[PDB]
């Protein structure tokens, strides 16, 4: 179905420290109170368009969502970025992958069915080892993990934030800014993407939003953390706030 | 103030659309900058007099 | 008789502070400029250069390059400047097309196989390869794309081999009218003309600071002195001021702080990850209080 | 009294020089004129700059 | 007035030291002139309003 995006999709536009200042920046952000599509993985992983950047978020309890596929035709005819989280090592590859009829990371794990061929590859990266959830579990979710994926002039920029939550039905109300983590120079024309769910079915949910060029007024507190924000095109009051560069209007 | 829109200020043409429709970006940005400087100066003069 | 404001007292620095990451490695430029085989321009290679000490004076002063053109930066400053990453876009082009590898330029190559950003910062390096890549009976290993549906955005690598439909007729791999292949090649021969000889071109894309730097020029660091007016250089960003201790909790990804005027407020030292506030050294107007010179010259 | 196409002349890899004033070579497909005159003559190579 | 120090005025960067530390003299003097013109205009506007 769909839900109302409640104060989400804001990331640090750059890596410069500021504090006790409201700084105005124009970049690709998720508009406030926009509609975001609600997907279920009980009793799916369809392909969505990739366009102007994508906001992705998920709530987890058993690490069902483990990866992403990005590209144009996704059929070994063009280059396609592949990100896989296999509970130990994060694997990033940029190959002309031949994908399976139903890509998934099924369960412990003994199936790796997301692709079948990898030829004419131009990039590979692997992070450090670790351990992750691999058992099918139930209950209220504990960690909401928000991501931003955008491609500007060949650089695929990934931002993310992990936070504890205690809420299953919808997005928690509150405010949280997304820090940058990864910047991959790939140069691939990406028009569609798909997520990867771990199937035993699952019981988790994820959210897909889309970014638009909007101007935001970001409030940095004394600790240099963004604590509030104004979506300058949300409504006339936000426009007024942008004009006066203040959150209080006389 | 309105009459000032007719001035070239060193540009090939006073009409902004006529610059944009015939030259590509690199040099056109220079020709546009010439008009922006002149027209911005015209507004500042108007506001000061007001 | 009166008080006049005549000048400005400004404390001058006493010593310089030069700070760079403590890396003891040289950048592998020899394995890229002196390579056994270059990639084709339709499938140009992009090698990442990082975590090393570079020296751009050797490449610039060497009398072997056919062209050495830099945007955003100047060739003699590269020894001081340092970067988060450097990318080397390596491919072979035809000589008369060297002029097309540039921001703001258009043509069949600039638009179909290698497009630069119009705000590109970096250097276009080229030299002829008539005695290495060209062969007798011609070199047919260099392919470029002649036909594309759209024009390339900057730094897209269109490796596709899909057959071009020059009309409404579907081709599905046929080579006839209204059905041509996008891939074409050059026959480079030692007897061909200057403009038709192969050239090896490497474009060096430089990312100014926004993150911890890993590729810095050949400059030794010095010790850091606090609470004194100094002329500092932190990863190539220079200025004058007093460096003091701070309580600003930078996030692991933040390297520099800024004021309302965009001047540097604080820096994180690249060798020891601590935050130093930069307060410009004390200054102020100087006024002279004097009786008129018809009475006394005391002030 | 005709329809011109300046992309063929510009993209063709046969001309020694192609230098335009007032207009940009990629905009000529959009622009139109009351008349065009072609001044045709042979010069010596080093004099092309003149 | 202080906010105006953040403007480029057509220059590659609003930070004067960042221009001087990367480009040599000849073109850098041009980039500096762009900032001088913009910042001098900003001061004149401030003084007139005062
Ligand atoms: C989102 O879309 C659904 C159906 O398209 C609609 O029922 C819902 O009210 C929308 N929400 C918002 C906030 O527009
Ligand atoms: C997951 O796949 C990656 C892909 O190379 C592999 O390196 C890793 O060992 C796999 N993890 C397993 C099987 O637990
Ligand atoms: C990859 O490169 C080889 C180079 O010989 C080429 O033959 C092949 O068609 C390309 N594409 C794929 C999918 O292998
Ligand atoms: C800033 O950080 C300090 C760290 O001790 C904390 O005590 C303070 O509360 C933080 N600021 C705010 C507004 O919470
Ligand atoms: C890092 O910098 C410090 C500065 O004194 C130096 O002692 C240390 O050896 C450097 N690290 C390496 C690996 O050289
Ligand atoms: C390439 O090789 C030549 C001679 O073999 C050498 O003089 C030159 O310095 C080399 N280039 C680099 C970048 O090492
Ligand atoms: C990217 O691929 C899409 C096909 O989905 C195509 O329409 C678009 O033009 C491509 N981009 C470029 C720059 O060619
Ligand atoms: C200032 O100088 C003039 C000329 O020397 C002299 O006549 C006048 O008295 C002086 N003023 C005072 C206050 O002494």
Strands annotated E in chain A: 2-4, 16-17, 21-29, 35-40, 48-49, 54-60, 65-71, 80-85, 90-95, 98-104, 113-117, 123-126, 143-152, 155-164, 179-185, 192-197, 205-210, 212-220, 226-231
CA distance A107 to A12: 37
Structure tokens, C252: 């692991």
Instruction: Please state the length of chain C.
Output: 299
| Distance between CA atoms of residues C34 and C65, nearest Å | 12
Q: Which residues contact C194 (CB under 8 A, 6 or more apart)?
A: C95
Can you read off the two tokens belonging to residue C111? 């638009």
Within 8 A by CB and 6+ apart from B7, the residues are B14, B38
Task: Count interface pairs B-D at CB distance under 8 A.
Answer: 18
3-class SS letters over chain C: CEEEEEEEEECCCCCEEEECCCCCCECCCHHHHCCCCCCEHHHCEEEEECCEECCHHHHHHCCCCCEEEEECCCCCCCCCCEECCEEEEEEEEEHHHHHHCCCCCCCHHHHHCCCCCCCCCEEEEEEECCCCCCCCCCECCCEEECCCCCCCCCCCCCCCCCCEECCCCCCCCCCECCEECCEEECCECCCCCHHHCEEEEEEEEECCCCCCCCEECCCCCCCCCCCCEEEEEECCEEEEEEEEECCCCCCCCCCEEECCCCCEEEEECCCCCCEEEEECCCEEEEEEEECCCCCCCCC
CA angle A197, A202, A203 (to 5 degrees): 120
Q: Does C151 touch chain D (CB under 8 A)?
A: no
Ligand 1 center from residue C167 Cα (angstroms): 42
- Alpha-carbon span A34 to A6, nearest angstrom: 8
CA atoms within 13 A on the CB side of C201: 25
Contacts of C255-260 with CB under 8 Å at 24 or more apart are: C255/A15, C255/C209, C255/C210, C255/C211, C255/C212, C256/A15, C256/A16, C256/A17, C256/C209, C257/A16, C257/A17, C257/A18, C257/A19, C257/A224, C258/A16, C258/A17, C258/A18, C260/A21, C260/E2, C260/E3, C260/E5, C260/E6
Distance from C-alpha of D50 to C-alpha of E38, rounded to nearest angstrom? 38
Residue holding tokens 């640090």? A12
Q: Which atom of ligand 7 is nearest to the CA of A189?
A: 1
Q: Domain range spanning residue A142?
A: 2-250
CB contact under 8 Å between B26 and C106, yes or no, is no
State how far the Cα of C14 lies from the Cα of C229, in Å rounded to an integer. 7
Task: Please indicate the experimental technique that yielded this structure.
Answer: cryo-EM
User: How many whole angstroms separate alpha carbon A179 and alpha carbon A148?
Assistant: 10
Which residues of chain C make contact with A78, given a CB cutoff of 8 A? 159-160
Please list every residue in chain E whose beta carbon sits closer than 8 Å to the beta carbon of residue C73: 22-23
Q: Which residues of C105-133 are buried (b: 16+ CB within 10 A; e: fewer)?
A: bbbbbbbbbbbbbeebbbbbbbbbbbeeb
Q: Which of A47, A69, A46, A68 has the alpha carbon at shortest distance from A57? A: A68
3-class DSSP assignment, residue D46: helix
Ligand 7 center to A119 CA (angstroms): 22
C106 touches chain D (CB under 8 A): yes
Q: What is the DSSP string of E16-28?
A: HHHHHTTS-HHHH
**Whose CA is closest to C183, among C156, C158, C152?**
C158
Is the separation of the CB atoms in C191 and C137 below 8 Å?
Answer: no
- Segment (H or E) for D29: none
Give the helix/strand (H/E) hosting A168: none
Backbone angles phi, psi at A183, to 5 degrees: -140, 105
A138 touches ligand 4 (CB under 6 Å): no
Residue E45 carries which DSSP code?
H
* CB neighbour burial string for D6-29, b if at least 16 within 10 angstroms, e if fewer: eeeebeeeeeeeeeeeebbbbbbe
Q: Cα angle vertex A35, ends A31, A37, to 5°? A: 125
Token digits of residue C233: 């250089």
Centre of ligand 8 from the C-alpha of residue C294, in Å = 6
d(CA C133, CA C114): 20
User: Can you say how many angstroms the Cα of residue C256 is from the centroid of all Cα atoms in its chain?
Assistant: 19
The H or E element spanning position E8 is: none
Cα C41 versus chain centre, distance: 21
How far apart are alpha carbons A221 and C16 in whole angstroms? 34
Would residue C107 be called left, alpha or beta, if left means φ above 0 and alpha means ψ between -120 and 50 degrees? left
Question: Quick check: D17 contacting C, CB < 8 Å?
Answer: no
Number of domains in chain A: 1
Task: Of A38, A74, A73, give the one whose Cα is nearest residue A56.
Answer: A38
Q: Can you read off the two tokens belonging to residue C55? A: 């020296």
The answer to whether the beta carbons of residues C96 and D13 sit under 8 Å apart is yes
Phi, psi of A133 (to 5 degrees): -60, 140
Token pair recorded at residue A245: 């560069």
> CATH number for the domain including A207?
2.60.120.960
Rounded-to-integer distance, Cα C191 and Cα C137, Å: 10
Closest Cα to atom 2 of ligand 5: C22
Q: Is residue A208 within 8 Å of residue A2, measured between CB atoms?
A: no
Q: How far is CA C118 from CA A42, A57, A151, A246, C122, in A?
A: 48, 34, 17, 35, 12
Task: Give me the phi and psi of A161, to 5 degrees please.
Answer: -150, 135
DSSP-H helix ranges across chain E: 16-20, 25-49
Is residue C158 within 8 angstroms of chain A, CB to CB?
yes
Which of D22, D26, D31 lies closest to B24 in CB terms? D26
Q: Best of B44, B45, B49 to disrupt the E interface by mutation (most E CBs within 10 Å)?
A: B44
Q: Do A89 and A125 contact (CB within 8 A), yes or no?
A: no
- Give the gap in angstroms from C-alpha D31 to the nearest C-alpha of chain B: 7
Concatenate the DSSP letters of all residues of A225-250 into one string.
-EEEEEETTS-HHHHHHHHHTSS---
Residue of D24, D28, D31 best to disrupt the B interface, most CBs of B under 10 A: D24
């Amino acid at each position: 179905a769909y839900t109302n995006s409640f104060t989400r999709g804001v990331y640090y536009p750059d890596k410069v420290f500021r504090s006790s200042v409201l700084h105005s920046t124009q970049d690709l952000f998720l508009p406030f109170f926009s509609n975001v599509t609600w997907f279920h993985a009980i009793h799916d992983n369809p392909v969505l368009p990739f366009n102007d950047g994508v906001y992705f978020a998920s709530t987890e309890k058993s690490n069902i969502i483990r990866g992403w596929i990005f590209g144009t035709t996704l059929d070994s005819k063009t280059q396609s970025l592949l990100i896989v989280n296999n509970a130990t090592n994060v694997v990033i590859k940029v190959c002309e992958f031949q994908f399976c009829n139903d890509p998934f990371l099924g369960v412990m794990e003994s199936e790796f069915r997301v692709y079948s061929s990898a030829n004419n590859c131009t990039f590979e990266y692997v992070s450090q080892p670790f351990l992750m959830d691999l058992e099918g579990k139930q209950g209220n979710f504990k960690n909401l993990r928000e991501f931003v994926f955008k491609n500007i002039d060949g650089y695929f920029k990934i931002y993310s934030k992990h936070t504890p939550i205690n809420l299953v039905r919808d997005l928690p109300q509150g405010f949280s800014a997304l820090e940058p983590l990864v910047d991959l120079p790939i140069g691939i024309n990406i028009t569609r993407f798909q997520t990867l769910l771990a199937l035993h079915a699952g019981a988790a949910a994820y959210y897909v939003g889309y970014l638009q060029p909007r101007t935001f007024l970001l409030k940095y507190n004394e600790n240099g953390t963004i604590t509030d924000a104004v979506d300058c095109a949300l409504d006339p009051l936000s426009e007024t706030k942008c004009t006066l560069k203040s959150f209080t209007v006389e | 103030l309105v009459k000032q829109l007719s001035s070239n200020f060193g540009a090939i043409s006073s009409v902004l659309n006529d610059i944009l429709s015939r030259l590509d970006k690199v040099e056109a940005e220079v020709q546009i900058d010439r008009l922006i400087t002149g027209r911005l100066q015209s507004l500042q003069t108007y506001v000061t007099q007001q | 008789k009166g008080i006049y404001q005549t000048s400005n007292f400004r404390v001058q620095p006493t010593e310089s502070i030069v700070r760079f990451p403590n890396i003891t490695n040289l950048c592998p430029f020899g394995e890229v400029f002196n390579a056994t085989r270059f990639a084709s321009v339709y499938a140009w290679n992009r090698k990442r250069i990082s975590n090393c000490v570079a020296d751009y004076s050797v490449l610039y002063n060497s009398a072997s390059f056919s062209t050495f053109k830099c945007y955003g930066v100047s060739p003699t400053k590269l020894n001081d400047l340092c970067f988060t990453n450097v990318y080397a876009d390596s491919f072979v082009i035809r000589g008369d097309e060297v002029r097309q590898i540039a921001p703001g330029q258009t043509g069949k190559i600039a638009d179909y196989n290698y497009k630069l950003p119009d705000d590109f910062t970096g250097c276009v390096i080229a030299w002829n390869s008539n005695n290495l890549d060209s062969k007798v009976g011609g070199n047919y290993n260099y392919l470029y794309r002649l036909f594309r549906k759209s024009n390339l955005k900057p730094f897209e690598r269109d490796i596709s081999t899909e057959i071009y439909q020059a009309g409404s007729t579907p081709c599905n791999g046929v080579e006839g009218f209204n059905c041509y292949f996008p891939l074409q090649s050059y026959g480079f021969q030692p007897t061909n003309g200057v403009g038709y000889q192969p050239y090896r071109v490497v474009v060096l894309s430089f990312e100014l600071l926004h993150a911890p730097a890993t590729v810095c020029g050949p400059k030794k660091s010095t010790n850091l002195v606090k609470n004194k007016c100094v002329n500092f250089n932190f990863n190539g960003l220079t200025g004058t001021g007093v460096l003091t201790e701070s309580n600003k909790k930078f996030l692991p990804f933040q390297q520099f702080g800024r004021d309302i005027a965009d001047t540097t407020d604080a820096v994180r030292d690249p060798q020891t990850l601590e935050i130093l506030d930069i307060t410009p050294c004390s200054f102020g107007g100087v006024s002279v209080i004097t009786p008129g010179t018809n009475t006394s010259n005391q002030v």
